[PDB]
């Protein structure tokens, strides 16, 4: 059946911070949260494990580290359980490969619904973040999942454990939401500072923009392209208005 993973703001941000910094080597960690029914996987928090260059392998997931960190998590009142793991690949897309699969599989034998989350931070500069969520065949509710229906019964009967993607939603919190927007009195000080110093220097700023303008007029004469000539004039006009406004 249909599965929907809510990844939180503070999780996104820890995954992306770590994964960008590890580059070109991969970083993986455990996702913390709770499983609810068969339709909701909450990722509330996330921490990093040690780094891997080998593609993440079964020898490599620190048994000590996860146990030791959780015991400390416990005293700061983080008590909700591991729901899966996230892993980076920079350079390779947002997918699995067989090593991840073997990693993944071992987690699921422990849990039963675990998710693999893959971030590619090379595709997190496509001006969206590409992120995916995966699970192997694992059944016990996924028995209505991969004119039909002969196929999937035989698909889980011929082979248990084959990847599939999962859907993504982001649920967040209003205080988190307001914090994200108040990024963009220190504020007052800065805008004003530039305004002041712009006004000091304007005697020169005046001269260079007549010269640019003089050029622009001349180009258009020869020309008798158009977009470029317009844009150059538009920038000069924009700047003047802002400059009159400043005093």
């Amino acid at each position: 059946t249909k599965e929907t993973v809510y990844i939180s703001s503070i999780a996104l941000l820890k995954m992306l911070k770590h994964g960008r910094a590890g580059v070109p080597m991969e970083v993986m960690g455990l996702m913390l949260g709770e499983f609810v029914d068969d339709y909701t996987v909450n990722v509330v928090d996330v921490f990093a494990m040690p780094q891997s260059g080998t593609g993440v392998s079964v020898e490599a997931v620190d048994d000590v580290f996860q146990a030791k960190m959780m015991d400390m998590l416990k005293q700061t009142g983080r008590d909700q359980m591991v729901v899966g793991w996230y892993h980076s690949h920079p350079g390779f897309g947002c997918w699995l490969s067989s090593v991840d699969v073997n990693t993944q599989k071992s987690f699921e034998q422990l849990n039963s619904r675990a998710v693999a989350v893959v971030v590619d931070p090379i595709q997190s500069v496509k001006g969206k973040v590409v992120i995916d969520a995966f699970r192997l065949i694992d059944t016990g509710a996924l028995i209505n999942n991969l004119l039909n229906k002969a196929n999937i019964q035989a698909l889980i009967h011929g082979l248990n454990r084959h990847y599939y993607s999962l859907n993504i939603d982001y649920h967040k919190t209003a205080k988190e939401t307001k914090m994200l927007m108040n990024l963009h009195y220190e504020e007052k000080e800065e805008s004003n500072l530039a305004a002041t110093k712009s006004m000091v220097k304007i005697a020169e700023q005046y001269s260079k923009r007549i010269e640019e303008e003089k050029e622009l007029t001349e180009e258009e004469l020869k020309t008798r392209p158009k977009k470029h000539l317009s844009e150059t004039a538009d920038e000069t006009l924009e700047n003047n208005i802002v400059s009159v406004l400043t005093a």
Partner: peptide, 8 residues
């Protein structure tokens, strides 16, 4: 513009 990206 953003979609293509590095390495090139």
């Amino acid at each position: 513009k953003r979609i293509q990206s590095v390495p090139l």
